Amino acid sequence: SFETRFEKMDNLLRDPKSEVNSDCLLDGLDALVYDLDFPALRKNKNIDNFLSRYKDTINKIRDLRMKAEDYEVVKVIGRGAFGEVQLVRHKSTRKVYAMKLLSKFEMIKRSDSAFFWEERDIMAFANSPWVVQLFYAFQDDRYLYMVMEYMPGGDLVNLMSNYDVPEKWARFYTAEVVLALDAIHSMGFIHRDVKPDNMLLDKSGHLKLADFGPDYISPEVLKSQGGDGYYGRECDWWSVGVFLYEMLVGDTPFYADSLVGTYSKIMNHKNSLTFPDDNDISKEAKNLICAFLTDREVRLGRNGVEEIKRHLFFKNDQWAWETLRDTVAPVVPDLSSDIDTSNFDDLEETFPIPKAFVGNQLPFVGFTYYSN
Amino acid sequence: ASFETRFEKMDNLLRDPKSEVNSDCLLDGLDALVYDLDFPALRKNKNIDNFLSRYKDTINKIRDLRMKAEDYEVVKVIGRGAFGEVQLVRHKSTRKVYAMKLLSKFEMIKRSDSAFFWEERDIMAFANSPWVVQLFYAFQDDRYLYMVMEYMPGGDLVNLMSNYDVPEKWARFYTAEVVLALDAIHSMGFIHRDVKPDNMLLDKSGHLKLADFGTCMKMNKEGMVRTPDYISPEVLKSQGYYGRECDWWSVGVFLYEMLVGDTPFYADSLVGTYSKIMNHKNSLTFPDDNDISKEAKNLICAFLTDREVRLGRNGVEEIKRHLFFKNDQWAWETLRDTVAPVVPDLSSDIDTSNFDDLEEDKGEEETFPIPKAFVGNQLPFVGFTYYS
Ligand SMILES: CN(CC(=O)N1CC=C(c2c[nH]c3ncccc23)CC1)c1ccccc1
Ligand SMILES: CN(CC(=O)N1CC=C(c2c[nH]c3ncccc23)CC1)c1ccccc1
């Protein structure tokens, strides 16, 4: 059938989850112009003629497509190894967002340029109240850009520093992390390193997970990094136990001065896991921490989220699992302005000119995403 | 500007068939990149090897979904050229017969000639004229460019002129259809540069259409462009700047050959022909024993004259008003409705009686050397794909 094959082709060209969608195919042409336009390369007739034929329209497309210049940087609200997070405002729409930038130079230099694909897909397609949304994803020759919802409530590292977390609060945050992880697991993904930095609080003080691509890592994720083991969803449930312990105790359960010491304490969890002498912690809170901080064969979460939800630590009279997001969060942030950075602490290299085709833009083809 | 205006202008560039960057040209770029990068020496670059792993699967899936040579069943080879051949083909699924023109990418790259086909592709795809051979689909693989066009079973006008003594009544019909065909091409901004009976094909009802635009060049904002019997004097002076009227000279040669039986500037030697063309004011003569009207002689002389005063240099309207076209069978708006002088008798949708059936070759699949660095041999063909 000719029209069935022609229809299937249009499906691939218009589906946002397709690698050959219209905005993805445009990335290939854009990358090709960035990577070919060098004097040594343009000596090749095929290259010089192709660029003459497409540099007018590619420069035109670069202007029409979303670009960094469409955003007004307000402040830098975060920083990482490969870039930074900026609170930005779209010039035309005036809407504020959080934009994550990833340096193509650093990524290529460190030979690490494929870690962002699952983060892009989870945030773009989750469609969940528990996952930070990615509205747009674009790029230029130097950076990858991720336009996400701004989470003014800050992160849980900040919350834990500013407050003495009572059990009533710890139960709320732990339950929201349980629902957030279940939404991610339902999509077919495993977070791997769930930590308080990945837990962001929206305008109403409710939690959403962000940042998909040592203290919080499970024993199986450590073992499997030596190229022989394997792990399941229960590796994220281990992280929940570490988070609950840090919240009620003030320290990570396997803290050590050295990275080796932490790694070793995690493997020796049956002997290193201890609750300080001066612990006001309930028996149900300790039960839940121990049920998560154990080997994967007997870990809570092995037989789904239901056994986690039924734990006595979650028994309370303020909320229910099915309506938890409608309840008032323990810390509802001060909604002063759309530019409020109160909950956040405040704080370039060009590629060498190629003498042959290097293709530095190739590992980024297909990153562009427009939610419409 | 407006944001939604930017994202609407984008969707226009992505849908417009005449756009350099519609979704077919964009898939061409990705398909060209997978061909040009999938070599073991290039796969040593991590960026290249990783990109190919990420897209090899979908590019092969897309190659199957998109139109390909295997969708067509070859029936005969009805024509041949330096860079390829023309095959009478039948679509496997639809069973409809077409004429497919193939152009060898190796012969093209090897001879450093890989940009002549763009005008032919655009004329046949966008002319939208009852007088220009239509291009339904255009596709490609790593070895060939393919052009799926309407099959013209009636043959060409060289064949028609050999088999018949063309009366004026017939010559007027064929000249009239060539005038409408050249005007469609001129309206698009092109100059044929090689109008001869070889380019004029007859369809299943005997109606004429132009084909063979390998020689086509696009005019500038002032209408200028950069066999020997059909060539105008302005070209022989260079052999520069040529207007529309260099095509109208060939119409005059065509009309003379039709009514007389010989080309107006025939000679044993090429030099004798070139000399006769330059001396057109004295060499152009009509045989004493003729059934040529004063209006046919007027039209031929109006075309076979200096480009500074030639009929056509200011449009087709003055040509259409010529008294030679006055007749009682048809009008310019009723020409294609008329019964053509020679309506071909066809046994089947596959009948090739009006063509010299040719022997297929199926032997030269020559190789470009395996790239040790990025060569980009598929780059001059990005954007050739067309679907109607
Ligand atoms: C600091 N990171 C971590 C990260 O990947 N993320 C941290 C949290 C995000 C966020 C979403 N919405 C936000 N709203 C207010 C502040 C941060 C955010 C996005 C994800 C980072 C790492 C490497 C290179 C660059 C940045
Ligand atoms: C013979 N040339 C000219 C050519 O390009 N064309 C001549 C013939 C065509 C045709 C359309 N429809 C047809 N139907 C019945 C016969 C021929 C046709 C189309 C155009 C050629 C040159 C190089 C490589 C290959 C062929």
Residue numbers in the entry:
A (entry chain B): 6 to 218, 238 to 371, 378 to 402
B (entry chain A): 5 to 230, 237 to 249, 253 to 401
Provide excerpts from the study.
We apply this method to identify inhibitors of ROCK1 from almost one billion commercially available compounds.
The three azaindole inhibitors have a distinctive tetrahydropyridine ring linking the putative hinge-binding group with the atoms that interact with the P-loop. The structures were solved and refined to a final resolution of 2.34 Å (Compound 1) and 2.74 Å (Compound 22). Analogously for Compound 22, the azaindole nitrogen atoms involved in hydrogen bond interactions to the kinase hinge are only 0.4 or 1.0 Å displaced between the experimental and docked poses. For example, the carbonyl group on the docked ligand that interacts with the tip of the conserved kinase N lobe lysine 105 is displaced 1.8 Å from the experimental structure and the respective distal phenyl groups underneath the P loop are 3.4 Å apart. However, it is critical to note that the protein itself demonstrates shifts of similar size in our alignment, such that we observe displacements between our experimental structure and that used as a template in the docking procedure of 2.1 Å at the zeta nitrogen of Lys105 and 2.4 Å for equivalent backbone C-alphas (Phe87) at the P loop turn, or a 4.2 Å difference at the outer tip of that phenylalanine 87 sidechain. These observations suggest that the bulk of the observed ligand displacement is due to the malleability and differences in the protein component that the docking algorithms would not be expected to achieve. For instance, ROCK1’s helix C is partially unwound in the mid-section affording greater plasticity and this directly abuts the P loop and outer portions of the binding pocket. It is again reassuring that given those large adjustments in the protein, the ligand binding conformation itself is quite well matched between the two models, albeit with this tilted trajectory differential.
